[PDB]
């Protein structure tokens, strides 16, 4: 039984009960409200008393088009209409501070099983309760849900109640009446009531008849938590997809498109510089030379929103965030799910489960056929599209006596699909097939976790079992067996995912994907816009993306610090991901002895430290975290450096 | 260059001194039978990259 | 001939399996024996 006393397994589902879970979830939404109340204070452009407000921060930019949509925030250029806005954000920040404090209190006592209220001098029961007095008695026949399946009806009801509350809040406090026309914010109140009716009706149908689907999920907390995470990740991916199409619709122009017209002063952006011999005095600058001379010394300079393209930068920062997470949660749902499939194969409950979500893949025969189809389709697609990108790169670089005429410029999405793209081009045919190939690639590591958590067609051949989920390897036997556990297969899903997770970043930043080299001053790189009649001028090619996008990163003293830090973090993953763990263990031994010897000779007292070294499974953990965190600490710079795609194409240089 | 030499010199002093045995493997009671053996397996938190061919790689890297 | 005999001293083995790969595959004499986490010497070889 492999050790589970690690600091990052303290809050595992094994160590918590259903009552503690509720307490844990509540103990965070209260913190989340405290966080949400800080993203509101920071967004005050001018204080209520008249003192100047806070400089633009990315944490408030991604929510500003929403607070403008709800009327809490305004885009007004006048201070009088910008002084009221500040008072409102204070109201909702203080309000979220109060409600957050209640949820933390109702999470601390929930976590400690201490459900006693002083005013009523009576302790409630978690096993059975009326639910908000008479309201629940009429709907749940005076009883509470006894299982996860029976919790669907009551849980659905709660959702209907929350929706109804949001609708009442928009009508009474925000003044948006429910008019059912889908070009105004007033339609978010109308559908807040339609959804509250669907869910309440759906929440009663599931209470009277609890669902029998996935009956085994009731038995284990991690089994249900993982199916929810495989579902929440897909939902989050869908939210990212929907927010990209919607945030740049004509109906969303008053909130997203309006950002272009404003002047933003982000912290860490270029500021008015000064001469080396600068001596600033209160009244005036003396014997000093200061740049611009329009602002005070060391004052952040303005930035034209239109040049920056802030409407698409903010759309990307939100769209990518709910996709970088959506795919992380799909990966974790399979991981924490296969983490539960290891236990049912170890204690042997697998062959007796009648669920077709476990019974369908019982036989190894089908497993190889299912994995052999994901593997064959990934090969026939990651090759068909890579050879197109490589061929397009060769044709435009005039390598091997070829020209941009012989390239895949005539290949584009079919007419049936053309509605999916504003401007159809080979850049769109490639992106669809890259995501298809990028999904089937990281799906291989996921089908492995689902099917080979304990035994594989090869290990059953080699007479071996995978006793744990976090075992690095079985030694150098059979030429080597490293990276065979499902935790390692999770790492190879996160690592392989970085490609499709980058085909999104590139494709939403208006870059070219149909060629490694687009827009460089070479033989046919600048002949794309006219060979294919592109209505837009994409910022750069896959490789030339790094050169162009970084002209704005190097100009910023903070975006460049991220570039440095992000690169420093990423290569350090090589130290713990290379097969040098044995070398590190020896080296440290020399360091402990060396330090002991130095202390001994140098000081009469002898002091030793016994330097520690991480384990492989503990190495592949810190390895993926340093590789993934480093790889997307810098993807932020591509999105936050500006959106530099243009609607004017380039004529051939000739 | 002084730091860059002393860094890759560590991997070289280990090839010269720990080709067959090291203070750690004499402690762990192990023999480095070979110059191109990858690891001894997961054992002792693992012992990958311990041969002199691997120490050559960590000098080139 | 079966005159000489070969054995694993189990307390000494670290399970690296270098011995297992020298055994002819049609004579599957050496094998693996699991009882714990591999990072804690949880596996050994035996003839």
């Amino acid at each position: 039984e492999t050790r589970s006393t690690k600091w990052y397994q303290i809050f595992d589902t094994e160590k918590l009960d259903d009552e503690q879970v509720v307490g844990g979830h509540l103990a965070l939404l209260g913190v989340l409200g405290f966080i949400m109340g800080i993203y509101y204070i920071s967004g005050i452009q001018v204080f209520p008393w008249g003192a100047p407000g806070f400089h633009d921060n990315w944490f408030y930019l991604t929510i500003k088009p929403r607070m403008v949509s709800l009327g809490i925030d305004t885009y007004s250029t006048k201070t009088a209409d910008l002084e009221a806005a500040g008072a409102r954000l204070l109201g909702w920040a203080a309000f979220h501070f109060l409600v957050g404090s209640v949820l933390i209190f109702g999470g601390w006592r929930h976590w400690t099983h201490n459900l006693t209220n002083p005013f009523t001098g009576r302790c409630g029961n978690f096993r059975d309760f009326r639910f908000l007095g008479k309201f629940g008695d009429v709907v749940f026949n005076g009883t509470s849900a006894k299982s996860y399946k029976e919790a669907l009806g009551p849980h659905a009801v709660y959702m209907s109640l929350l929706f109804l509350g949001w609708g009442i809040v928009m009508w009474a406090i925000l003044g948006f009446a429910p008019i059912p026309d889908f070009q105004t914010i007033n339609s978010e109140t109308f559908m807040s009531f339609v959804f509250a009716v669907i869910f309440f009706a759906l929440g009663i149908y599931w209470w009277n008849n609890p669902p029998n689907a996935a009956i085994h999920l009731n038995d284990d907390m991690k089994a249900a938590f993982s199916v929810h995470l495989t579902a929440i990740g897909y939902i989050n991916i869908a939210l990212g997809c929907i927010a990209f199409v919607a945030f740049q619709q004509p109906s969303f122009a008053p909130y997203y498109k309006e950002l272009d017209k404003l002047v933003f002063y982000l912290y860490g952006e270029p500021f008015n510089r000064v001469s080396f011999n600068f001596v600033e005095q209160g009244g005036k600058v003396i014997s000093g030379a200061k740049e611009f001379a329009d602002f005070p010394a060391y004052a952040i300079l303005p930035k034209s929103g239109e040049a920056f393209g802030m409407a698409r930068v903010v759309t990307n920062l939100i769209v990518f965030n709910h996709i970088i997470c959506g795919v992380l949660y799909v990966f974790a749902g399979v991981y924490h799910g296969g983490q539960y499939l290891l236990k049912i194969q170890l204690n042997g409950m697998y062959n007796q489960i009648k669920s077709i979500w476990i019974t369908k893949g019982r036989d190894q025969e089908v497993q190889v056929k299912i994995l052999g189809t994901v593997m064959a389709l990934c090969f026939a697609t990651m090759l068909s599209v890579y050879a197109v990108i490589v061929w397009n790169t060769i044709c435009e670089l005039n390598i091997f006596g070829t020209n941009i005429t012989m390239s895949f410029y005539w290949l584009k999405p079919l007419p049936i699909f053309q509605w999916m793209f504003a401007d159809p081009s080979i850049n769109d045919w490639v992106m669809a097939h890259v995501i298809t190939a990028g999904s089937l690639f990281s799906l291989i590591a996921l089908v492995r976790i689902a099917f080979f958590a304990h035994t594989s067609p090869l290990w059953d051949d080699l007479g071996l079992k995978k006793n744990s989920y976090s075992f690095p390897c079985l030694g150098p036997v059979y030429g080597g067996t490293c990276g065979v556990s499902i935790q390692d297969q999770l790492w190879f899903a996160m690592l392989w995912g970085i490609k499709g997770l980058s085909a999104v970043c590139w494709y939403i930043d208006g870059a070219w994907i149909a060629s490694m080299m687009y827009g460089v001053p070479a033989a046919d790189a600048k002949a794309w816009d006219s060979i294919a009649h592109l209505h837009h001028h994409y910022t750069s090619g896959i490789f030339y993306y790094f050169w162009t996008e970084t002209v704005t990163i190097f100009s910023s003293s903070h975006l460049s610090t991220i570039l440095m830090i992000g690169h420093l973090v990423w290569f350090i993953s090589f130290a713990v991901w290379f097969e040098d763990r044995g070398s590190r263990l020896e080296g440290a031994d020399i360091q402990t002895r060396t330090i002991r010897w130095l202390g001994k000779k140098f000081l009469n007292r002898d002091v030793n430290f016994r330097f520690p070294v991480l384990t492989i499974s503990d190495s592949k953990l810190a390895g993926t975290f340093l590789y993934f965190g480093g790889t997307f600490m810098l993807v932020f710079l591509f999105l936050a450096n500006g959106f530099y795609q243009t609607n004017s194409p380039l004529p051939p240089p000739v | 260059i002084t730091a860059g030499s002393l860094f890759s010199l560590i991997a070289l002093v280990r090839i010269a001194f720990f080709a067959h045995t090291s203070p750690l493997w004499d402690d762990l009671g192990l023999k480095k039978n070979s110059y191109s053996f990858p690891c001894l397996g997961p054992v002792y938190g693992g012992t990958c990259g311990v041969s002199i061919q691997d120490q050559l790689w960590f000098a080139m890297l | 001939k079966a005159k000489k005999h070969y054995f694993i001293i189990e307390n000494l083995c670290v399970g690296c399996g270098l011995c297992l790969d020298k055994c002819p595959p049609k004579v599957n004499a050496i094998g693996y024996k699991f009882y714990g986490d591999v990072q804690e010497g949880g596996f050994r070889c035996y003839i």
Binding site: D461, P476, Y478, G479 | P38 | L18, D21, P25, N28
Partner: peptide
Amino acid sequence: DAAKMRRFLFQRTETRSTKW
């Protein structure tokens, strides 16, 4: 087919052998 399959991995092992 296990044996035949193992004769191959054995044909590509971490033990001493002749290499090109």
